[PDB]
Design a protein around this ligand. Structure first.
Ligand SMILES: NC[C@@H]1O[C@H](O[C@H]2[C@@H](O)[C@H](O[C@@H]3[C@@H](O)[C@H](N)C[C@H](N)[C@H]3O[C@H]3O[C@H](CO)[C@@H](O)[C@H](O)[C@H]3N)O[C@@H]2CO)[C@H](N)[C@@H](O)[C@@H]1O
Ligand SMILES: [Mg+2]
Ligand SMILES: [Mg+2]
Ligand SMILES: [Mg+2]
Ligand SMILES: [Mg+2]
Ligand SMILES: [Mg+2]
Ligand SMILES: [Mg+2]
Ligand SMILES: [Mg+2]
Ligand SMILES: [Mg+2]
Ligand SMILES: [Mg+2]
Ligand SMILES: [Mg+2]
Ligand SMILES: [Mg+2]
Ligand SMILES: [Mg+2]
Ligand SMILES: [Mg+2]
Ligand SMILES: [Mg+2]
Ligand SMILES: [Mg+2]
Ligand SMILES: [Mg+2]
Ligand SMILES: [Mg+2]
Ligand SMILES: [Mg+2]
Ligand SMILES: [Mg+2]
Ligand SMILES: [Mg+2]
Ligand SMILES: [Mg+2]
Ligand SMILES: [Mg+2]
Ligand SMILES: [Mg+2]
Ligand SMILES: [Mg+2]
Ligand SMILES: [Mg+2]
Ligand SMILES: [Mg+2]
Ligand SMILES: [Mg+2]
Ligand SMILES: [Mg+2]
Ligand SMILES: [Mg+2]
Ligand SMILES: [Mg+2]
Ligand SMILES: [Mg+2]
Ligand SMILES: [Mg+2]
Ligand SMILES: [Mg+2]
Ligand SMILES: [Mg+2]
Ligand SMILES: [Mg+2]
Ligand SMILES: [Mg+2]
Ligand SMILES: [Mg+2]
Ligand SMILES: [Mg+2]
Ligand SMILES: [Mg+2]
Ligand SMILES: [Mg+2]
Ligand SMILES: [Mg+2]
Ligand SMILES: [Mg+2]
Ligand SMILES: [Mg+2]
Ligand SMILES: [Mg+2]
Ligand SMILES: [Mg+2]
Ligand SMILES: [Mg+2]
Ligand SMILES: [Mg+2]
Ligand SMILES: [Mg+2]
Ligand SMILES: [Mg+2]
Ligand SMILES: [Mg+2]
Ligand SMILES: [Mg+2]
Ligand SMILES: [Mg+2]
Ligand SMILES: [Mg+2]
Ligand SMILES: [Mg+2]
Ligand SMILES: [Mg+2]
Ligand SMILES: [Mg+2]
Ligand SMILES: [Mg+2]
Lengths: 138, 125
RNA sequence: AGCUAGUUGGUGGGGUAAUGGCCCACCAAGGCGACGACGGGUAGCCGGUCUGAGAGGAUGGCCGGCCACAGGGGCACUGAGACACGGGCCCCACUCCUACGGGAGGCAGCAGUUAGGAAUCUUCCGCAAUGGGCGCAAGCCUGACGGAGCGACGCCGCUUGGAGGAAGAAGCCCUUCGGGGUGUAAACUCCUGAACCCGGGACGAAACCCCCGACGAGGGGACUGACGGUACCGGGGUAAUAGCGCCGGCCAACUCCGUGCCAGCAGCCGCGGUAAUACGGAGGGCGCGAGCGUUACCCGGAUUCACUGGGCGUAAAGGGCGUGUAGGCGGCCUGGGGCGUCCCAUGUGAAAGACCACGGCUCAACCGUGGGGGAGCGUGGGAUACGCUCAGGCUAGACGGUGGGAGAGGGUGGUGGAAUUCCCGGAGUAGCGGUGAAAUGCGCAGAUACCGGGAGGAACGCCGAUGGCGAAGGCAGCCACCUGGUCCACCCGUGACGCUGAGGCGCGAAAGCGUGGGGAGCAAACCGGAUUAGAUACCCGGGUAGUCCACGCCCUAAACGAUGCGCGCUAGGUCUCUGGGUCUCCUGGGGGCCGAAGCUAACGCGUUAAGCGCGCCGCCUGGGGAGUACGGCCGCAAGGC
RNA sequence: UUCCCGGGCCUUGUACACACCGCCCGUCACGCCAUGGGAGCGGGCUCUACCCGAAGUCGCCGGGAGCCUACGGGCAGGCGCCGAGGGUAGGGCCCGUGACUGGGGCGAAGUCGUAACAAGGUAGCUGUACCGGAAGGUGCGGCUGGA
RNA sequence: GGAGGUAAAAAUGGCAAAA
C-alpha cells in the first residue's frame, strides 16, 4: 500500500547497489523526483529519466559504482555506503538551522525539505531555513 | 517497540531496593545485645563466626557479625550497627563497629586499627 | 473503573475592594472520566544543585522568588493591608500560681535546656556599617544585620626544615651466608626561620548635624568603629606534630615467621584443612597527607527501560485464531488556506549561580566589574517543499462485474460394504486365548476354528501422497440440499473506499461438567495373574465413567513454522498441486528441497526470509519462590484470565 | 562372533567433563527465617446518618423589662441558621497480633525409592482427568525439543 | 522395494577440592 514511498525508494536503490544493477524503476512523484535531482548534483547516480511502464510513469535511475578492486571479493566499493530515512511517517522530524547534524563530519550529505524547496545541509545552512530532515547519505 | 507504543506504555524505571533497612538508611544505629553466639557457615567453608542478635531503637531484632579476634559481648551490652553483609552467613546483613560503646576494640591488633577499633599504641615505636 | 447534592446550568438576591454555587431561594437535569475522573500512598514548588560526552536520571540543603503554618481546630474584630508568630474570643491537650471561685502562659525569633537520635554549636560583643519602624530634627528601638566564639563538616592556602653526608654506622628483615634491604635515611656540619618577644598600627566613615548660599543646587567645617590593638608593617628570635588505608586478580605494591577448613579475611571471583605474597604479626613497598578509611544515599559505569541508543525461531519475550470500535498511519496530479513546520524583528526569560575576560584580598578559596548566547511563551511580518484541512481530478492500492476452475471447508438429511462383539440354527472335537516364557481366564454345561441367519454401535481399507482445504483448532465411504473462503481469464464499472488494531465480540483439539438418549470395540479408576527386594507400573485376562448423538457449559496446550498482520524491493536451479495462453514454452496462485548477495552468537533463514525498508498491535528485562498467595472478574464444579 | 570381559576406527545421542564408580528428581526426619489461611482480638485514617453543640459573623425581636448626648436611632440583651468539637450507631481501606494449618526458601556428608539425561533400560515433554508413600503411573488428544 | 519399523531382565556410588 506504500506507507512511505520515499523510504521505499531509498531501499529500491539499496537493494540494487548491493547487486550492482545497471538501473532500477521506482514509482513517480515530483517530491521523490526532486530528491533524485539532489542525488545527481553530489554525484551518487548518473541520472534518471521519466520512463513509462505499463502505461504508468516510473523513474529509471542510472546507478553509479566504484572501480573493480583487486584481491579476493572483487566487488567494487560502493559510492553510496549508507542511506536511510530519518523523518519516518510514524515519527516526524523537524529541525531548524542551529539543529543540523554534521553528517559524516561534512563528508556526507543531509537532505531536508524546506520552505524554499528541498535542499541539502550546505545550502540550507547558507540560506538559513531548515525543516524536515528527510535522509542521510554517505 | 513502535514510537506510538512509547507514548502509551512508556518506559519503566528500575526503582532498586535497599539491602539495608536501617530506618531512612542512617549510617549507624544503636542497639542492645540479647544473645552472643556462633553460627556455622555455608557449604564451601567451615568455621565458628561470632554473632549477636541485636534489638535496635527501631523496635526490630536482627543478627549482626562480630569481627576481629576476641571481644566483650554479653547478654546486656550496648553496641553500634555498621551495615554490610556476610556472604557465608545466612540472615546476617549487618556489622558491628568496635571501640566506643561497651563493645571494645580488638586489642593486640597492629595493622588495621581504624577498622576493628584499636587505638594507637606507643612502645618506643 | 466508574465519580458527583451545591453536584452541573439558569433567574433573582446576599456578600466582597472585585468575577464566581463563595453563600441562599426557585427552575432546568445536568457535569467528569482509559487523553485515566474518583479513591489510596508520597511530597512544599522554582531559579538552581549533583551527575552524565550528550540526551537524560536524581535532588530542592546554604542564598534568592512564590505558597502554606505559629501546641491541635474554628471564628471574627481592628485596619490601606491580617482571619494576624511575640494581638483578641472559644473548645481540646499540657505547664504553673491560688485564700479553690478563677487566673497566667504558647522558642517553627536569638542563644540555651530536656527528650529523641549516628549526629549538629555561643544563655558572646555592638548599632560603627547597611537596612527597617517612628520623629521636622536631636535621637530611640532593632538577637534584621555587622562581627567574634565552638566543630577538620567542606573547599582553599601553609608548616613539621633546606643544602651537604659512607662503596655506604647501629638496630631490624631476607639470604643459595659470599651478600643484599631499610638507606642520604639517620648521626654530624653550614644556612634559612613556623611559632613566640617588642614597637607601630588601619581601610571599612561619610553622611544625617553645623556655617555661607533662601533650611534648594553648590562650597566649607566638625563627630562617631563592636570587630580590635585584630589583620598588616618594622626589629629580634627557636630545627620545630605525622598519620591512615592497601600490597592474589580487577588494582599500584613481596619476602619471612606464626596458624593448620581452627583462628579468621571478604565488594565480586573466592582464600585457609602443613611449606598461604588473600588469615595474624614483622620487614619492605605502593597510594594519599592534616588527613586516611568505613557505613548510608544519588548519578555514572548500565546501550541491564535502549528518543538519541536494545530486543522476541532455539537464550526472558508473537497474543490460540479470526472479526472489528476508538486510536495510530496512509497512493498519484493541480489549486485555496497557513494549524504543525521554518525564518527575521520585538517583549519576557529577576538577581545570584554556571561559561569567558579583567580586577580586589601578598596566591587561591571567596569576591567585584563587564560580555555572550540558551531552550520556552506572547506579538507583528514572511515563506509553502513536507505533514494537516478544503475543493477538482486520476488510476497502479482496494472493491465489484462477466465466464470458468479445483478442494477431506462448514451444517442438515438419507445411505453402502468389510470387520469386531452378542444371540439363534447347523456341523464339529480336547483344548483355546495369552507371553520373552508362563499363569489368571475361557472350555466336554460342547469352547477355538467353519457355514448360514439376526441385532447393535463405532470407524471408513484400496484410492492416499513427500497431496489438497480452512484464519486457527481442525477436516477422509457415498449421495443430495443449504453455505462460506479462494484462484484464473477478460481488463468492463466504482473510484482512495486502504493497512493495523487497546477494549469488546465470535470461533476454540483432547480431557472434564449438566440433562436425556446410546453402548459393539477400546479403555482412566478398579480387581485378578505373572515380574521384582518391593509394583499402587511397564506384560497378560476382565472391566465402570468416558470415547458416540442432540442441546447448554468449560477456554486450556509443545493451540508450533516455539517465527503477528499488510505492502514495496533483492540471482537462480529443481519436485509437485491447481488456472490460462500464439498449451515446445511463457505466465498466475499454493505446498517442498538446494542455494547469489545478505543476516545471525552459531545452528540456520534465504521472493512461503530469521534479508533490506515502512505502518500498527501484543510481549521481554537474571534464576528460584510462581503462573503461587491476596484482591477483582468468570464458572455448576474442576478451574481459567 | 549371536552372548560375558577388555580394546581400535567411523557415526549418532547427551542435562556427563576430578567424565556412568557421572548426574539428578521427589516425599519423609531436624534447625532457622519470611509469607498466606485462620475462631478472632487490637490500632490508625476515612465515609454516612442522627443527638448535643462554645466563640463568632449574619438574619428577626429589642417587648409587660435596662442604659444612651439630637429618640419613626444606638448599646446591652433574647431568639434563629451555620458551626469547631464531643457522642451514638453502621460501613470502606490499611497495619499489628492469634492457638493452629497450607505450601515455600535456606541449612557440607541422615531415610525411602529411580522419575529425567545414552532407546536412561516403558522415547521424552505436555493440556486435562483419575489413582498411588514419593519421584511418578495410566487414559484421551497433541508436539519433535526422538527413531 | 518404498513403507509399516525390534527390547524380558537388574537398583545404588557421602561432601568439598589443583598451575
Ligand atoms: N532447593 C529447592 C527445593 O529443594 C527441595 O529439597 C530440599 C529437601 O528436600 C532436601 O533435603 C535433602 C534430601 O533430599 C537428601 N536426601 C538429604 C540431604 N541432606 C537433604 O539436604 C538438606 O538437608 C541438610 C541437613 O539435613 C542440609 O544441610 C542441606 O543444606 C539441605 N540441602 O534439600 C533441599 C533443601 O536444600 C526439593 N528438591 C524441592 O522442593 C526443590 O528442589
Ligand atoms: Mg564539526
Ligand atoms: Mg510533608
Ligand atoms: Mg550514559
Ligand atoms: Mg511546639
Ligand atoms: Mg514567640
Ligand atoms: Mg543521646
Ligand atoms: Mg544600625
Ligand atoms: Mg539607620
Ligand atoms: Mg643499616
Ligand atoms: Mg577608617
Ligand atoms: Mg617579620
Ligand atoms: Mg600490580
Ligand atoms: Mg606457611
Ligand atoms: Mg602475604
Ligand atoms: Mg599478610
Ligand atoms: Mg586483601
Ligand atoms: Mg541509562
Ligand atoms: Mg547505577
Ligand atoms: Mg531506542
Ligand atoms: Mg537485549
Ligand atoms: Mg527451554
Ligand atoms: Mg524460550
Ligand atoms: Mg501465532
Ligand atoms: Mg506465546
Ligand atoms: Mg500522504
Ligand atoms: Mg502557520
Ligand atoms: Mg538570570
Ligand atoms: Mg479527493
Ligand atoms: Mg477501465
Ligand atoms: Mg483485520
Ligand atoms: Mg472445547
Ligand atoms: Mg470431549
Ligand atoms: Mg457427558
Ligand atoms: Mg479389553
Ligand atoms: Mg527389581
Ligand atoms: Mg488392560
Ligand atoms: Mg506444528
Ligand atoms: Mg512458488
Ligand atoms: Mg536454504
Ligand atoms: Mg496483531
Ligand atoms: Mg494453569
Ligand atoms: Mg585401523
Ligand atoms: Mg560412541
Ligand atoms: Mg548410576
Ligand atoms: Mg428619630
Ligand atoms: Mg428613627
Ligand atoms: Mg488478622
Ligand atoms: Mg494474621
Ligand atoms: Mg505459619
Ligand atoms: Mg550436616
Ligand atoms: Mg520415565
Ligand atoms: Mg530410567
Ligand atoms: Mg524412560
Ligand atoms: Mg496426560
Ligand atoms: Mg494405574
Ligand atoms: Mg539408598
Ligand atoms: Mg571444601
Amino acid at each position: 500500500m506504500l506507507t512511505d514511498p520515499i523510504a521505499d525508494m531509498l531501499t529500491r536503490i539499496r537493494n540494487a547497489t548491493r547487486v550492482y544493477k545497471e538501473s532500477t524503476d521506482v514509482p513517480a512523484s515530483r517530491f521523490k523526483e526532486e530528491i533524485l535531482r539532489i542525488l545527481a548534483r553530489e554525484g551518487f547516480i548518473k541520472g534518471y529519466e521519466r520512463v513509462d511502464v505499463d502505461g504508468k510513469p516510473y523513474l529509471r535511475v542510472y546507478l553509479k559504482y566504484g572501480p573493480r578492486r583487486q584481491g579476493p571479493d572483487p566487488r567494487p566499493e560502493q559510492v553510496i555506503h549508507h542511506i536511510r530515512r530519518i523523518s519516518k511517517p510514524g515519527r516526524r522530524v523537524y529541525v531548524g538551522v542551529k539543529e543540523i547534524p554534521r553528517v559524516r563530519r561534512g563528508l556526507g550529505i543531509a537532505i531536508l525539505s524546506t520552505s524554499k524547496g528541498v535542499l541539502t545541509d550546505r545550502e540550507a545552512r547558507k540560506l538559513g531555513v531548515g525543516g524536515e530532515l528527510i535522509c542521510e547519505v554517505w | 517497540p513502535t514510537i506510538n507504543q512509547l507514548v502509551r506504555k512508556g518506559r519503566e524505571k528500575v526503582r532498586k531496593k535497599s539491602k539495608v533497612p536501617a530506618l531512612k538508611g542512617a549510617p549507624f544505629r544503636r542497639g542492645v545485645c540479647t544473645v552472643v553466639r556462633t553460627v556455622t557457615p555455608k557449604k564451601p567453608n567451615s568455621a565458628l563466626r561470632k554473632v549477636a542478635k541485636v534489638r535496635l531503637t527501631s523496635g526490630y531484632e536482627v543478627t549482626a557479625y562480630i569481627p576481629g579476634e576476641g571481644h566483650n559481648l554479653q547478654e546486656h551490652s550496648v553496641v553500634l550497627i555498621r551495615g554490610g553483609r556476610v556472604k557465608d552467613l545466612p540472615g546476617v546483613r549487618y556489622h558491628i563497629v568496635r571501640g566506643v560503646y561497651d563493645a571494645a576494640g580488638v586489642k593486640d591488633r597492629k595493622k588495621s586499627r581504624s577498622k576493628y577499633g584499636t587505638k594507637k599504641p606507643k612502645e618506643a615505636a
